[PDB]
From Swiss-Prot, chain B:
Region Integrin-binding motif, annotated ranges: 42-44
Subunit structure comment from the entry: Binds to host ACE2. RBD also interacts with the N-linked glycan on 'Asn-90' of ACE2. Cleavage of S generates a polybasic C-terminal sequence on S1 that binds to host Neuropilin-1 (NRP1) and Neuropilin-2 (NRP2) receptors. Interacts with host integrin alpha-5/beta-1 (ITGA5:ITGB1) and with ACE2 in complex with integrin alpha-5/beta-1 (ITGA5:ITGB1). May interact via cytoplasmic c-terminus with M protein. May interact (via N-terminus) with host bilirubin and biliverdin, thereby preventing antibody binding to the SARS-CoV-2 spike NTD via an allosteric mechanism.
The encoding gene: S
Domain of life: Viruses
The protein, known as: Spike protein S1
Protein purpose: Attaches the virion to the cell membrane by interacting with host receptor, initiating the infection. The major receptor is host ACE2. When S2/S2' has been cleaved, binding to the receptor triggers direct fusion at the cell membrane. When S2/S2' has not been cleaved, binding to the receptor results in internalization of the virus by endocytosis using host TFRC and GRM2 and leading to fusion of the virion membrane with the host endosomal membrane. Alternatively, may use NRP1/NRP2 and integrin as entry receptors.
Phenotype when changing S12P: In strain: Omicron/BA.1, Omicron/BA.2, Omicron/BA.2.12.1, Omicron/BA.2.75, Omicron/BA.4, Omicron/BA.5, Omicron/BQ.1.1, Omicron/XBB.1.5, Omicron/EG.5.1
Lineage: Viruses, Riboviria, Orthornavirae, Pisuviricota, Pisoniviricetes
Length: 49, 49
């Protein structure tokens, strides 16, 4: 967890869970970054705020 | 008393997936009851669970 007023600009692939997988995806880790699924035609929950 | 170290840390099985709790935190954590549901399915039906 990140403390209040703390900045991390690193975009690279790092440890996700409690077990470091040493860089490249594998060894029961996952890809940390995700993208928004925003669709204009769906309801309130998918609307950006 | 169930030993989850040889069940997880040994990596003797094919795969495992956790929800809401890390697999390394299950040694120091536990709940009231634990159940085991045994059934046989196909490979394409694994994602349906």
């Amino acid at each position: 967890n990140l403390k209040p007023f703390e900045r991390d600009i690193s975009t690279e692939i790092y440890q996700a869970g409690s077990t470091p997988c040493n860089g490249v995806k594998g060894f029961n880790c996952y890809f940390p970054l995700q993208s928004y699924g925003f669709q204009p035609t769906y309801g309130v929950g998918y609307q950006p705020y | 008393v169930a030993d989850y170290s040889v069940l997880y840390n040994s990596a003797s099985f094919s795969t495992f997936k956790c929800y809401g709790v890390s697999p390394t935190k299950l040694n120091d954590l536990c709940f009231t009851n634990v159940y085991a549901d045994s059934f046989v399915i196909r490979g394409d039906e694994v994602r349906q669970i």
